[PDB]
Amino acid sequence: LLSFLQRLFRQKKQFKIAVVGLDSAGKTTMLNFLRFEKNIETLPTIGVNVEVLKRQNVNLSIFDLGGQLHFRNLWGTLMKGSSAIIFVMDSADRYRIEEAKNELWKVLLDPNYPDAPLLIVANKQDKEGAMSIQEIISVCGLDNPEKLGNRSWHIQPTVATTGQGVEEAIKWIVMELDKLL
Amino acid sequence: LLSFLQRLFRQKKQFKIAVVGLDSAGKTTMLNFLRFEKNIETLPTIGVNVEVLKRQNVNLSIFDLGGQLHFRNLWGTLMKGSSAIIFVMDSADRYRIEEAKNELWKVLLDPNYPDAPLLIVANKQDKEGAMSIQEIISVCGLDLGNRSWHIQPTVATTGQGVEEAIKWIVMELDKLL
Ligand SMILES: Nc1nc2c(ncn2[C@@H]2O[C@H](COP(=O)(O)OP(=O)(O)O)[C@@H](O)[C@H]2O)c(=O)[nH]1
Ligand SMILES: Nc1nc2c(ncn2[C@@H]2O[C@H](COP(=O)(O)OP(=O)(O)O)[C@@H](O)[C@H]2O)c(=O)[nH]1
Ligand SMILES: [Mg+2]
Ligand SMILES: [Mg+2]
Numbered sequence A: 001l002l003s004f005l006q007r008l009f010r011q012k013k014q015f016k017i018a019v020v021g022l023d024s025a026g027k028t029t030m031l032n033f034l035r036f037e038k039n040i041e042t043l044p045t046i047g048v049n050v051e052v053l054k055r056q057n058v059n060l061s062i063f064d065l066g067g068q069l070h071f072r073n074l075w076g077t078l079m080k081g082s083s084a085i086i087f088v089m090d091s092a093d094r095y096r097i098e099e100a101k102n103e104l105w106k107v108l109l110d111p112n113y114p115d116a117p118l119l120i121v122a123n124k125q126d127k128e129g130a131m132s133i134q135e136i137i138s139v140c141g142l143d144n145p146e147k148l149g150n151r152s153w154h155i156q157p158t159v160a161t162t163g164q165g166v167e168e169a170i171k172w173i174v175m176e177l178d179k180l181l
Numbered sequence B: 001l002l003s004f005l006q007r008l009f010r011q012k013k014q015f016k017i018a019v020v021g022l023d024s025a026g027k028t029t030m031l032n033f034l035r036f037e038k039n040i041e042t043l044p045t046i047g048v049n050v051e052v053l054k055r056q057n058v059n060l061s062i063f064d065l066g067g068q069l070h071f072r073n074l075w076g077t078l079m080k081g082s083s084a085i086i087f088v089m090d091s092a093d094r095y096r097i098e099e100a101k102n103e104l105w106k107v108l109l110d111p112n113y114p115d116a117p118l119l120i121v122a123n124k125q126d127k128e129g130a131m132s133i134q135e136i137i138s139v140c141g142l143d144l145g146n147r148s149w150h151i152q153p154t155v156a157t158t159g160q161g162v163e164e165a166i167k168w169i170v171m172e173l174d175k176l177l
Helices: A003-009 A027-034 A097-108 A133-139 A166-177 B003-009 B027-034 B097-108 B133-139 B162-173
Strands: A015-022 A037-043 A048-055 A058-065 A069-071 A084-090 A118-123 A153-157 B015-022 B037-043 B048-055 B058-065 B069-071 B084-090 B118-123 B149-153
Touching (some): A027 A048, A027 A058, A027 A084, A027 A166, A037 A058, A084 A097, A084 A166, A097 A118, A118 A166, A153 A166, B015 B027, B027 B048, B027 B084, B058 B097, B084 B097, B118 B133, B118 B162
Parallel strands (some): A015 A058, A015 A084, A118 A153, B015 B084, B118 B149
Antiparallel strands (some): A048 A058, A048 B069, A069 B048, B048 B058
């Protein structure tokens, strides 16, 4: 299971996969498949300890955007050292899609990691109200990608509750970080 | 309705009520009965912004304890200037009552506001496995001395016990009593 995670484990460096999105998008449900164990990341400047996940040299940092607590410089503090970003959206939630779009663009336009590959996960594709990946790309202003620049990006439909598309989502991230490709 | 909130509005100072407890205890649900307006408290010196509920000179700050974030000096940073504390517990969750007890004692043994009144809210009393307020007192070892405290059973979904819970806090903050 996920044999290709060895493409990260074999490299002599530390990886951090930032997994962000609004609450209830499905981030925890999606990453539960990896069975990574809890790790504590200390942020001495802020004076806060953060519960993250880690297996060997790969750290998964999951964070709800638009929650009760916001970091003023998320990408310079909790997400410092980000190698790749997974932005998870609830594709069935049209009430929150404009907020999700707005949070996605705050990540894309942040100056800390402009070259970190970013995967949009269009989650909850099993629900009757689910937006297509084409509609998500249009609503997000990604049909004509110019503001994104040279950043590698992709969109993957998923059903995190069954695991549909989850292995393919992780594969895209690992492939973008694989020095052998 | 809640006419006694005027006992805070008519006092010439700012009040901050820290509303803390584990995630899913019922903090947001309990406070919705007040209809305060969502606002953003910015804290540039700590590096975070927080959602607060505001009405006139009263601010309510909700924070989930024992979750992903653990602040070293919560009562001197995020909850600085707390006038009163409301600690909400899911009384029906025996799987998390020991973590709630541990978080409560971390709050009690903290040196920032050792005398702001503290209300323990034993929420979800409507649920089948709900613990009594006496069993919560026994589990948490509350059977302090230098601090004003009370425990109130509530059903945040219907509002049962919520008026008495806010009433106790306002009475503790009311210099006209
Ligand atoms: N129908 C459906 N529900 C999902 C899916 N993924 C997650 N959920 C549910 O959405 C809710 C929020 O999921 P969670 O992983 O906690 O979200 P997070 O806050 O982004 O970590 C939970 O009730 C999940 O069971 C999905 O693909 N389809
Ligand atoms: N049965 C029952 N459910 C409750 C009660 N209070 C809250 N809930 C539910 O518990 C969940 C968590 O409540 P919420 O206000 O988000 O908790 P918070 O994280 O502490 O702010 C929601 O599904 C609420 O509807 C209660 O007194 N009884
Ligand atoms: Mg969440
Ligand atoms: Mg919460």
